[PDB]
Every structure is written in structure tokens, then in C-alpha cells.
Structure 1
């Protein structure tokens, strides 16, 4: 099959590994997997579009971690935004000064 070759990307192989890191024996169906895939795509497009507006407002043609930080501070409500900004900052600081 060389003409039947079109691989649609997803987030199944990642959300499965995050689930095994959180609950080491709990599984998940494929319908709930598609709901988690649509959730990741939804929140991705929300934060990307909000950061694109936050770049266009300040006449800047570059998205960095600061626009994503303030987009997370706008879109996520309450303590969820604070924990997501803490986790994001910790991951960026771990990423920059690594091997």
C-alpha cells in the first residue's frame, strides 16, 4: 500500500504516557482518547490564538514564552493558571540550562 499512506497526527501516545505516570494501572477507551485529543487541540488553539492577539496588540512579530505566560494567565481561571505558570516556568528553566 503506497497510495494508501496518510498518517494523521494525534496526542494518543502522549496522553497515554501521562496517564501511566499519574495512574499506573488505570486504562482509557478510544472515545475518551479522542475527547482528550480534542481537548489538547482546543486548549492549544486557544492559547496560540490568544498569544497571537497578544503579540499583534504590542506590534511584535514574535511569540516567546512571555506571550504564552500571559495567555495562560488570561485563559485559565483561578489557581489553575498559577500552577500552569509555575510548571511552565520550571520546565523552561530546566530546558535552558540542561545538557
Structure 2
């Protein structure tokens, strides 16, 4: 279990500048992020065992996202992940 709460707060203020969040609600948001992190990281671990090299790359994360997320969320998440890696790579 890790804390993402300041970062969750920053995202909240982008999508709703005028809405705050209680400590208990923030606790639930932070739990969601930890749960999804662990599901993607566990799926990524499995996919890496198939590869020539024992590495988790953005390719393993993308596959893990496509397997773990429901299909419509998966599609949008993959678009966001791909765009971030492209911009970082440049």
C-alpha cells in the first residue's frame, strides 16, 4: 500500500476545480490506485516470463492494461499510456 493522495488531489482539481474531497473519500481513491497498480504489475510479471528478456517494458504494461481493464476503459487507457510514452521518448 503506497500513498498517491497529493497526486489524486491534483487530478481532482483539474476535473473539478471547485470540488474538494474528504479524508475517507481520499482513502478510497488511494485504495483504488493501489489495487489497479498491483493487478497491472502482477499481470506484467506474468507476461515478462514469456519474453526473450525478463524485462517489464511499456509493451508488457499495455498488454496487462488490455487484459485487466474492461474493454472500453482499456481502449482509452491504452491511448493515454501510448501518448505519454511517445512524449517522454521524444
Q: What TM-score results when the alignment is normalised by the length of structure 2?
A: 0.93
Q: What TM-score results when the alignment is normalised by the length of structure 1?
A: 0.85
Which has the larger share of helix? 2
In the aligned structure 1, how far is the partner of 2:28 from the partner of 2:76?
A: 23
Report the alpha carbon displacement of residue 59 of structure 1 after superposing the two structures with TM.
5.3
Q: Which runs of 4+ in 1 moved over 6 A?
A: none
Query: Which aligned pairs between 1:3-82 and structure 2 lie closer than 5 A?
Result: 10-58=3-51, 60-82=53-75
In the aligned structure 1, how far is the partner of 2:19 from the partner of 2:72?
A: 27
Bigger mean CA deviation after superposition, 32-41 or 50-59: 50-59
Q: Aligned residues, how many?
A: 90
> 2:80 maps to what in 1?
87
Report the alpha carbon displacement of residue 80 of structure 1 after superposing the two structures with TM.
0.6
Q: CA RMSD in A?
A: 1.4
Gap runs ≥5 in structure 2: none
Where 1:57 maps in the other structure, the secondary structure is coil
